[PDB]
C-alpha cells in the first residue's frame, strides 16, 4: 500500500503545515500538523475543555462506529516551545492520503495549552518520530507510520514541504519526479527517539564550506533552523544590522535586508536554503525589524533541522530495520 497527501502552510510565513487526516467511520477529517519530532497522534475532541477550543475541528468518538476507548490509557506531552496537551485515548481507523490503519491510537485532548487554542488552523498533531517517544501510559502506543509500515510497499515516508506553497507527504514510495539529482542517505541514531543525524558542515552565502559535524534532528514540527551559536553568529554577521535581541528572543534583522543563502552538508552533498526562506517577517505588525529563520540552539540541548531547512529538500525518512535519512535537492 501507499498514501499521498498534500500539506498546506497554515499562514503566509509557513509557520506550520497542515495535512488532512480521516479519522473514524464515517470519516471525520481533521487537519493535523505532521511532526517528525514527536510520536503522539492527538486531536482536539468532543472531550476538550470548551474554553480551550477556538475554531478547531474536533474529533467526536461517539459519532464513530469504529472508535473504542483504550481503557485506562492516558497521555500528556510537553513540546520544546513550552506548549502541552493531555487526555485519554481511543483506537479508531485513521487514513492519510488513501493509506488506512485500523486500530490506531487517537489521543483525545481533554486539555491543551494556550498556543494550541490560539491556532484555529491546527486540529492536532500526527507524530512521526520513533514510537519510543509516545507518551501513552500505561501501554505505550505506536505511531501511524509504525502501524502502517508492514503494509507499505517500502518502509518509508517522504516530506516535500513547500516554500509559501503546498507540498506533499508520501507513505510507502519515493516519487522520483519530486526531486532533482540523486538522494544522499545518511545514518540515523534512534537513541533519543528522533530522526537524529549528523550534517557534514555549512556555508553562508557564497562563502567557503566549513567541514564540521553538526548533530541534529529532522523535525517537520519545528518552524525554524536551530544550530550552534558559532554557526548562527557566522550567518547573521553577513547581514548589516542583524543582532541577537533578548527582548524579542533571537536574531532580528532589518526588513530592508537581502538575506544570504545557507548551505548544509549531507555527506558529500549540499542543500542550499535560499535567503528568502530565512525571512520570517516583522517581529510585530508594521515593524521594520524582521525575525530570522536561523536561530541558536544553545538554550535547547539539541540542534533542529526544522521546516526552514527541510523545505529546501526532498526528505526521505527510511524506517527500514536500520533507519536512515535521505536528502535531495528539488
Ligand atoms: C505551530 C504552533 C503555532 C507553534 N503550534 C503549537 O503550539 C505547536 C506546534 C507544533 C510543535 C509544538 N507547538
Ligand atoms: Na515567533
mmCIF file with all atom_site columns, N, CA and C and ligand atoms in Angstrom, residues 10 15-16 33 35 79-81 83 113 115-116 119 122 125 221-223, ligand 1:
data_model
loop_
_atom_site.group_PDB
_atom_site.id
_atom_site.type_symbol
_atom_site.label_atom_id
_atom_site.label_alt_id
_atom_site.label_comp_id
_atom_site.label_asym_id
_atom_site.label_entity_id
_atom_site.label_seq_id
_atom_site.pdbx_PDB_ins_code
_atom_site.Cartn_x
_atom_site.Cartn_y
_atom_site.Cartn_z
_atom_site.occupancy
_atom_site.B_iso_or_equiv
_atom_site.pdbx_formal_charge
_atom_site.auth_seq_id
_atom_site.auth_comp_id
_atom_site.auth_asym_id
_atom_site.auth_atom_id
_atom_site.pdbx_PDB_model_num
ATOM   1  N N   . UNK A 1 10  ? -0.045 26.961 7.119  1.00 0.00 ? 10  UNK A N   1
ATOM   2  C CA  . UNK A 1 10  ? -1.172 27.498 7.916  1.00 0.00 ? 10  UNK A CA  1
ATOM   3  C C   . UNK A 1 10  ? -1.266 29.011 7.720  1.00 0.00 ? 10  UNK A C   1
ATOM   4  N N   . UNK A 1 15  ? 4.500  29.036 9.069  1.00 0.00 ? 15  UNK A N   1
ATOM   5  C CA  . UNK A 1 15  ? 4.763  28.725 10.489 1.00 0.00 ? 15  UNK A CA  1
ATOM   6  C C   . UNK A 1 15  ? 4.612  27.225 10.769 1.00 0.00 ? 15  UNK A C   1
ATOM   7  N N   . UNK A 1 16  ? 3.689  26.593 10.074 1.00 0.00 ? 16  UNK A N   1
ATOM   8  C CA  . UNK A 1 16  ? 3.471  25.149 10.203 1.00 0.00 ? 16  UNK A CA  1
ATOM   9  C C   . UNK A 1 16  ? 2.694  24.748 8.981  1.00 0.00 ? 16  UNK A C   1
ATOM   10 N N   . UNK A 1 33  ? -0.987 18.599 12.116 1.00 0.00 ? 33  UNK A N   1
ATOM   11 C CA  . UNK A 1 33  ? 0.406  19.016 11.935 1.00 0.00 ? 33  UNK A CA  1
ATOM   12 C C   . UNK A 1 33  ? 1.275  17.767 12.035 1.00 0.00 ? 33  UNK A C   1
ATOM   13 N N   . UNK A 1 35  ? 4.446  15.785 12.513 1.00 0.00 ? 35  UNK A N   1
ATOM   14 C CA  . UNK A 1 35  ? 5.578  16.208 13.333 1.00 0.00 ? 35  UNK A CA  1
ATOM   15 C C   . UNK A 1 35  ? 6.586  15.070 13.458 1.00 0.00 ? 35  UNK A C   1
ATOM   16 N N   . UNK A 1 79  ? 6.000  20.092 24.657 1.00 0.00 ? 79  UNK A N   1
ATOM   17 C CA  . UNK A 1 79  ? 6.860  20.295 23.472 1.00 0.00 ? 79  UNK A CA  1
ATOM   18 C C   . UNK A 1 79  ? 7.996  21.267 23.801 1.00 0.00 ? 79  UNK A C   1
ATOM   19 N N   . UNK A 1 80  ? 8.949  21.367 22.871 1.00 0.00 ? 80  UNK A N   1
ATOM   20 C CA  . UNK A 1 80  ? 10.156 22.204 23.000 1.00 0.00 ? 80  UNK A CA  1
ATOM   21 C C   . UNK A 1 80  ? 9.833  23.680 23.152 1.00 0.00 ? 80  UNK A C   1
ATOM   22 N N   . UNK A 1 81  ? 8.658  24.114 22.687 1.00 0.00 ? 81  UNK A N   1
ATOM   23 C CA  . UNK A 1 81  ? 8.243  25.541 22.702 1.00 0.00 ? 81  UNK A CA  1
ATOM   24 C C   . UNK A 1 81  ? 7.442  25.868 23.969 1.00 0.00 ? 81  UNK A C   1
ATOM   25 N N   . UNK A 1 83  ? 4.615  24.410 24.930 1.00 0.00 ? 83  UNK A N   1
ATOM   26 C CA  . UNK A 1 83  ? 3.190  24.055 24.771 1.00 0.00 ? 83  UNK A CA  1
ATOM   27 C C   . UNK A 1 83  ? 2.970  22.619 25.263 1.00 0.00 ? 83  UNK A C   1
ATOM   28 N N   . UNK A 1 113 ? -2.747 23.628 25.855 1.00 0.00 ? 113 UNK A N   1
ATOM   29 C CA  . UNK A 1 113 ? -2.201 24.944 26.283 1.00 0.00 ? 113 UNK A CA  1
ATOM   30 C C   . UNK A 1 113 ? -2.654 26.016 25.325 1.00 0.00 ? 113 UNK A C   1
ATOM   31 N N   . UNK A 1 115 ? -1.256 28.127 23.346 1.00 0.00 ? 115 UNK A N   1
ATOM   32 C CA  . UNK A 1 115 ? -0.690 28.253 21.983 1.00 0.00 ? 115 UNK A CA  1
ATOM   33 C C   . UNK A 1 115 ? -1.461 27.349 21.016 1.00 0.00 ? 115 UNK A C   1
ATOM   34 N N   . UNK A 1 116 ? -2.023 26.234 21.494 1.00 0.00 ? 116 UNK A N   1
ATOM   35 C CA  . UNK A 1 116 ? -2.861 25.372 20.626 1.00 0.00 ? 116 UNK A CA  1
ATOM   36 C C   . UNK A 1 116 ? -4.221 26.023 20.452 1.00 0.00 ? 116 UNK A C   1
ATOM   37 N N   . UNK A 1 119 ? -4.315 28.752 17.849 1.00 0.00 ? 119 UNK A N   1
ATOM   38 C CA  . UNK A 1 119 ? -4.100 28.366 16.443 1.00 0.00 ? 119 UNK A CA  1
ATOM   39 C C   . UNK A 1 119 ? -5.317 27.589 15.945 1.00 0.00 ? 119 UNK A C   1
ATOM   40 N N   . UNK A 1 122 ? -4.967 24.402 13.324 1.00 0.00 ? 122 UNK A N   1
ATOM   41 C CA  . UNK A 1 122 ? -4.348 23.088 13.646 1.00 0.00 ? 122 UNK A CA  1
ATOM   42 C C   . UNK A 1 122 ? -5.281 22.308 14.555 1.00 0.00 ? 122 UNK A C   1
ATOM   43 N N   . UNK A 1 125 ? -1.961 16.973 16.187 1.00 0.00 ? 125 UNK A N   1
ATOM   44 C CA  . UNK A 1 125 ? -0.625 16.598 15.710 1.00 0.00 ? 125 UNK A CA  1
ATOM   45 C C   . UNK A 1 125 ? -0.628 15.127 15.324 1.00 0.00 ? 125 UNK A C   1
ATOM   46 N N   . UNK A 1 221 ? 7.869  19.434 12.619 1.00 0.00 ? 221 UNK A N   1
ATOM   47 C CA  . UNK A 1 221 ? 7.004  20.169 13.536 1.00 0.00 ? 221 UNK A CA  1
ATOM   48 C C   . UNK A 1 221 ? 7.661  21.378 14.163 1.00 0.00 ? 221 UNK A C   1
ATOM   49 N N   . UNK A 1 222 ? 8.885  21.687 13.768 1.00 0.00 ? 222 UNK A N   1
ATOM   50 C CA  . UNK A 1 222 ? 9.581  22.910 14.212 1.00 0.00 ? 222 UNK A CA  1
ATOM   51 C C   . UNK A 1 222 ? 9.705  23.839 13.026 1.00 0.00 ? 222 UNK A C   1
ATOM   52 N N   . UNK A 1 223 ? 9.340  25.100 13.214 1.00 0.00 ? 223 UNK A N   1
ATOM   53 C CA  . UNK A 1 223 ? 9.351  26.046 12.089 1.00 0.00 ? 223 UNK A CA  1
ATOM   54 C C   . UNK A 1 223 ? 10.766 26.380 11.609 1.00 0.00 ? 223 UNK A C   1
HETATM 55 C C1  . LIG B 2 .   ? 2.670  25.573 15.304 1.00 0.00 ? 1   LIG B C1  1
HETATM 56 C C2  . LIG B 2 .   ? 2.335  26.349 16.571 1.00 0.00 ? 1   LIG B C2  1
HETATM 57 C C3  . LIG B 2 .   ? 1.560  27.607 16.206 1.00 0.00 ? 1   LIG B C3  1
HETATM 58 C C4  . LIG B 2 .   ? 3.604  26.719 17.324 1.00 0.00 ? 1   LIG B C4  1
HETATM 59 N N1  . LIG B 2 .   ? 1.522  25.488 17.462 1.00 0.00 ? 1   LIG B N1  1
HETATM 60 C C5  . LIG B 2 .   ? 1.944  24.930 18.607 1.00 0.00 ? 1   LIG B C5  1
HETATM 61 O O1  . LIG B 2 .   ? 1.792  25.441 19.716 1.00 0.00 ? 1   LIG B O1  1
HETATM 62 C C6  . LIG B 2 .   ? 2.643  23.583 18.453 1.00 0.00 ? 1   LIG B C6  1
HETATM 63 C C7  . LIG B 2 .   ? 3.137  23.325 17.037 1.00 0.00 ? 1   LIG B C7  1
HETATM 64 C C8  . LIG B 2 .   ? 3.893  22.001 16.960 1.00 0.00 ? 1   LIG B C8  1
HETATM 65 C C9  . LIG B 2 .   ? 5.036  21.946 17.961 1.00 0.00 ? 1   LIG B C9  1
HETATM 66 C C10 . LIG B 2 .   ? 4.557  22.261 19.357 1.00 0.00 ? 1   LIG B C10 1
HETATM 67 N N2  . LIG B 2 .   ? 3.816  23.561 19.378 1.00 0.00 ? 1   LIG B N2  1
#
